Amino acid sequence: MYVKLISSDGHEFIVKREHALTSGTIKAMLNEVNFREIPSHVLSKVCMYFTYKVRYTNSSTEIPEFPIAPEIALELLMAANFLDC
Amino acid sequence: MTEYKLVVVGAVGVGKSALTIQLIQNHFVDEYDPTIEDSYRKQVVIDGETCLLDILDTAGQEEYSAMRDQYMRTGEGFLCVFAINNTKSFEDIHHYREQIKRVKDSEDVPMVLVGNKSDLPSRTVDTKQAQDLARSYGIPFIETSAKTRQGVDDAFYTLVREIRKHKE
Amino acid sequence: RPVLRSVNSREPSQVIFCNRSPRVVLPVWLNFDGEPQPYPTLPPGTGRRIHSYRGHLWLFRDAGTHDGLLVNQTELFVPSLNVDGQPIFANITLPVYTLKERCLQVVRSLVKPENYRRLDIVRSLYEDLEDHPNVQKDLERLTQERI
Amino acid sequence: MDVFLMIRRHKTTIFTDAKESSTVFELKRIVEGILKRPPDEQRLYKDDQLLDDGKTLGECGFTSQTARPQAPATVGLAFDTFEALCIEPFSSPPELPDVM
Ligand SMILES: Nc1nc2c(ncn2[C@@H]2O[C@H](COP(=O)(O)OP(=O)(O)O)[C@@H](O)[C@H]2O)c(=O)[nH]1
Ligand SMILES: [Mg+2]
Who surrounds ion ligand 2 at CB < 5 A? Predict the structure, then answer.
């Protein structure tokens, strides 16, 4: 099962639905969802975070830090707030 | 002139008070009130440097309050002292050390281990184990005895040396 | 009275604090009245042999930001009884922060509070920016979650 | 050992994982299930290198250290005849504001 996540600049991101359901706002919008305020460089980071969360949730050992470049910080913050994740 | 604030800690009956007075008034005191805790100031010379020692002779029951924590927190160096005739003192050294590390908020606090009453013939802990434990702590050990007054000044001056090393 | 307090057990327990996080770890001990008491910090990747007592409550935070951390894959830590004198191990790690909280962390490290609201973001994020991690608020949350 | 990858083609990006032992052909099957093209009409790339659908992912250079969940390694995808490997790039973040 997979979901398509379209960005504002037209990039199509295919992720497992279970991973995209991490976002409360995505789970609310439910197999193709478009975001007109999120560029590709932000939606890619959000998808990477989905995989990171699903991989390391309830892990038994150490967890790596989630890297966020300063230049993306603000945009990723706004996207996260809007996506509820 | 640079000041050095020293604090002498240990169990009741180890000889902290007598040792402290031996550093200053230059006389061994056979019996001191167990309840009297006070500070003393003395101008001395260590390696030529004219230092001012401020020595708090701790005494009294346990108090792990904020006020006692801050009072001990002002200590720059600590004399964890035990008596070779009392096993409990050598066991308690560890607890006193952990309390120092807590109030100073560091694992490295200037201190010197002291084995007192080296004039008494009875030995419950020899001079050898104390050096081993100090090695595990990373501090010097001095086997000074307030009664014979051998090595007392060595102990206090070694604490000033350890403080100087920590400040540099 | 508070549910999240340490027990006055007076029974020694040797514990190992292992900082398996990239952050500087502040150990926080809950005293017998439940109040958080900070203890000396652990640099990242450091293991330290500490001495505690049975039934004592411990939690671990980021020393600089008070961000939440995990110990043995849970929030709070209580030493067990030491079998045959071996030390108990306290593995301190990162949790899976929410993406919002992680981004708020990094933005807090870049901007200064004086300039927080001068950022072109929704006003809702300004208060979230000034709402720094709080040990007491997390204690309230944990207490009610036990309830 | 798991490797976390985003296989990309044009403006499309597929996020998926695999085993370091997983071979290039099994990943091509994975992409068949999603983009509806058999491991016949497609060719996978590591950087500019064409991957032979018989070697394992780890044999191509995909390690756990270089293909993390939070930083997946990229695998290019190209579909009579094939097409030039074309991966349309992501957007760029703005100039970092004054306050940071
Ligand atoms: N033989 C001997 N007795 C000592 C020595 N130091 C202290 N004492 C005795 O131990 C007793 C208790 O010591 P005190 O000064 O009161 O230690 P404090 O109460 O813990 O500060 C005193 O009556 C001293 O006479 C020492 O070096 N040798
Ligand atoms: Mg006394």
Answer: B 17, 59
